[PDB]
């Protein structure tokens, strides 16, 4: 016999620990795997896919949930009017929960990276006009009016021309720890603020829909991270 002294942790079972143990079926040769199109190797691949951002997450009615996918723009709105507004909070509840990005974050404790919202105008072809999308980094509350909003990073979007514009959120870091009621989860804090404004009124010729909708597509950029796992899932498996 070769000399051995046992160290603490002997006979111990750590759910995370991953050493090994014998195969229940030694001589079993698991049918080889063939080639299945589109394998995933790291969830972060997914976090870069654009998914529909339910910015219009207001109608809760059962047969309206489909409206949450898009917000509208129309003749009724006059220049300057604020169209919509949401936060850069891929994690936290809000419009982001609809995106795959969001849903994955929920399975993680903290993260950071650059985001990328896209806006698709689905109105008539004959429709024209300018919308002003503006991002206000953490802190500076939602710009008072359209004017002042423009004095900061913004993009004037013209659907008369390009029917789809993309805005990049510089960086959001959900790492600034916190402790609410008892759910001491690393609260964003870094809630950027995207606001979309009516730069010009909605313009359409006689014969076209005097109201259109805009779909929003978000997704994180290449430089996105996720740290710590958290199996928080309200949708759980139930025995028939």
């Amino acid at each position: 016999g070769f000399p051995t002294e046992l160290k603490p942790g002997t006979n111990q079972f750590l759910t995370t620990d991953d050493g090994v143990s014998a195969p229940i079926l030694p001589n079993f040769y698991p049918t080889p795997c063939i080639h299945i199109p589109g394998e995933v190797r790291n969830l972060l691949e997914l976090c870069q896919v654009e998914t529909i951002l339910e910015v219009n997450n207001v109608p809760t009615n059962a047969t309206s949930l489909m409206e949450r996918l898009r917000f509208p723009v129309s003749a009724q709105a006059g220049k300057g009017e604020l169209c919509a507004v949401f936060r850069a909070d891929p994690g936290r509840s809000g419009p982001w929960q609809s995106t795959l990005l969001g849903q994955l974050c929920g399975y993680y404790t903290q993260w950071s990276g650059s985001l990328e919202v896209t806006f698709m105008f689905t109105g008539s072809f004959m429709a024209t006009g300018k919308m002003l999308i503006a991002y206000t980094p953490p802190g500076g509350p939602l710009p008072k009016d359209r004017a002042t909003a423009m004095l900061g990073t913004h993009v004037i979007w013209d659907f008369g021309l390009q029917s789809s514009v993309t805005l990049v959120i510089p960086w959001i870091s959900n790492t600034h720890y916190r402790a609410h009621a008892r759910d001491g989860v690393f609260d964003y804090y870094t809630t950027g603020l995207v606001s979309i404004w009516y730069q010009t009124n909605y313009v359409v010729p006689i014969g076209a829909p005097n109201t259109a909708y805009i779909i929003a597509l978000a997704a994180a950029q290449k430089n996105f991270t996720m740290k710590l796992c958290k199996d928080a899932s309200d949708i759980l498996q139930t025995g028939t």
Partner: protein, 218 residues
């Protein structure tokens, strides 16, 4: 920031509790000092939602058996956990010649000894398991149900001819390893109705996530 915590193996690792057998000295449930547990990785609540992120998966699993008394006490009782390779018949009595058949891997351990652990290879005769099957495996409704996805069956029991002396509770933990996923699909957003299919409440459809007042008011 190392993107390693976002891999597939780092997402699906970690020993989770998937089974909890119960051998009460006397009562209703498992009145024969033994019970048959079918390997079901959904024994872990939030697991379903997760794996179901993909359409095809491949993996192995390391099962661990933490058994004690309901109180949490350790006792000098010897147990035998047996594995029923999908295809072989399971025990039906406290001495069905099933526990005898060698082709059914058994593993004896006392409660004195630390948890027992073993590895089950990727069973399925297919290239991979598949959480979804849009068809019928060539009276009754056999839809969505995929045959070959059966990982096997663990049959726990108190060694010996006579019943056990103390009440026992065997908890079964399983950590899957070496995972490969394919065809990512939308993330479940409606509560689950049955372990079987993806049916959902046909009226109680709620929005993917919380809602607000007006789209302009944050």
């Amino acid at each position: 920031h190392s993107t390693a915590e976002t891999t597939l193996d780092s997402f699906f690792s970690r020993a989770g509790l998937v089974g909890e057998i119960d051998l009460p000295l006397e009562g209703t449930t498992n009145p024969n000092g033994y019970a048959n547990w079918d390997i079901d990785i959904t024994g872990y609540a939030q697991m379903r939602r997760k794996v179901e992120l993909f359409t095809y998966m491949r993996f192995d699993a390391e099962f661990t058996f933490v058994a004690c008394t309901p109180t949490g006490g350790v006792v000098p009782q010897l147990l035998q956990y047996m594995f029923v390779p999908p295809g072989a018949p399971k025990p039906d009595s406290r001495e069905s010649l099933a526990w005898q058949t060698a082709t059914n891997p058994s593993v004896f351990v006392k409660l004195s000894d630390p948890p027992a652990q073993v590895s089950v290879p990727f069973m399925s005769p297919a290239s991979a398991y598949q959480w979804f099957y849009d068809g019928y495996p060539t009276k009754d409704l056999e839809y969505g149900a995929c045959p070959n996805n059966m990982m096997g069956t663990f049959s726990v029991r108190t060694v010996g001819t006579s019943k056990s002396k103390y009440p026992l509770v065997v908890r079964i933990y399983m950590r899957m390893k070496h995972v490969r996923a394919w065809i990512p699909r939308p993330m479940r957003n409606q509560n689950y109705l049955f372990k079987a299919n993806p049916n959902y409440a046909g009226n109680s459809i709620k929005p993917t996530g919380a809602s607000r007042t007006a789209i302009t008011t944050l």
